Design a protein around this ligand. Structure first.
Ligand SMILES: [Mg+2]
Ligand SMILES: [Mg+2]
Ligand SMILES: [Mg+2]
Ligand SMILES: [Mg+2]
Lengths: 151, 157, 157
């Protein structure tokens, strides 16, 4: 038995940079507004994983009301507690700028660390909306993730 | 033999509430403009399921230009799709749904959405996940113009 | 040994049509602005396949800065990605694609898209699904500023 999940997160630019994405500080004119560290890749990743496990989402488990890497780790703990193991993950950063490609190899390493898995089971990509939409206008950054879990 | 599918849908706000999402009537100051009842979550889910089964999409099965679907219950649409998918030899692995909305708050309603989806797919609640996420006031969902939903589905032959 | 991947692309409209989506030339009052042919569907699909294979993305493999890709047939880019993926020991499970557009109408063209993709991947077209979905006049797609597409892919070792 195997399970699929999907996650999506967005944070708005504000304040001064750098931004943290996939656990990597990327220098930029602007920072990202958030309650946590605003790591849109790790949030989206975490929700895909919880979603595959039918454990809900970060919103339910970790209320903004009541850091991302730790949220990921705590989510994974619970998910492994349920008998699941990693199949793979794939992540899609949607952003006009800054350039992500230089920082992506390091993000894989970090995610692999956090999920206790091999780097070849983690992929991360960047894609632009060609100046369209709120990401295109540089109002914020969005990220999507998918995950496959095996029981 | 496993198969994957992805779905995506959007409806604009207009009219008076409530809205219908994941089958649940949620109070809100506005309704959703739609040919059907406007259930973005069930639409996205139906497309993910049809996509995994390579049976096209809801635009093909349930076109808005057809007046027979006016006011349609999206749970009956889901059930109709799922009948075709099961006839084609498939059983459910799992589904994960991601509602994208600034408002109204969805988390209180997610448990009853899971109940309805699990009933409609004849599966256990443990194979249905629904999540809600905001765009932090950005974009059309952030400006409160409409609501989007995505879904992924895994099927087994 | 299954693997999932996800892809997403966008191009902006400009000039006159036709556009090229899923390898098919579709008449439209507007064309797409892109270094390559602008095929958002095949780009998204290619990224999903590369993502399942932990091989990166098309921004890395086929950069707009490289004059070799000026006017590239996006099917060639797909095939070249697929050859790299197959050299890694992956086989196709299935793919599902989601075109996000206000217009033009995609449904008439989807059967040819599926023929093209199936041929390009060496697979049966029962393993390929393509869907279209509107944002109902919302957002950049809704306002007719561009087209988006998403894809998911499942591979096996
Ligand atoms: Mg968020
Ligand atoms: Mg998406
Ligand atoms: Mg729709
Ligand atoms: Mg692109």
């Amino acid at each position: 038995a195997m399970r699929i999940g999907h996650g999506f997160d967005v944070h708005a630019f504000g304040g001064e940079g750098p931004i943290i994405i996939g656990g990597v500080r990327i220098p930029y004119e602007k920072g990202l507004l958030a309650h946590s560290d605003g790591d849109v890749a790790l949030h989206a990743l975490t929700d895909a994983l919880l979603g595959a496990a039918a454990l809900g989402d970060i919103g339910k488990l970790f209320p903004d009301t009541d850091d991302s890497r730790e949220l990921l780790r705590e989510a994974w703990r619970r998910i492994q507690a349920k008998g699941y193991t990693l199949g793979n993950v794939d992540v899609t950063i949607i952003a006009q700028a800054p350039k992500m490609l230089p920082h992506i190899p390091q993000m894989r390493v970090f995610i692999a660390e956090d999920l206790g898995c091999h780097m070849d089971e983690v992929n991360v990509k960047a894609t632009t909306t060609e100046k369209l939409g709120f990401t295109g206008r540089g109002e914020g950054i969005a990220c999507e993730a998918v995950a496959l879990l095996m029981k």
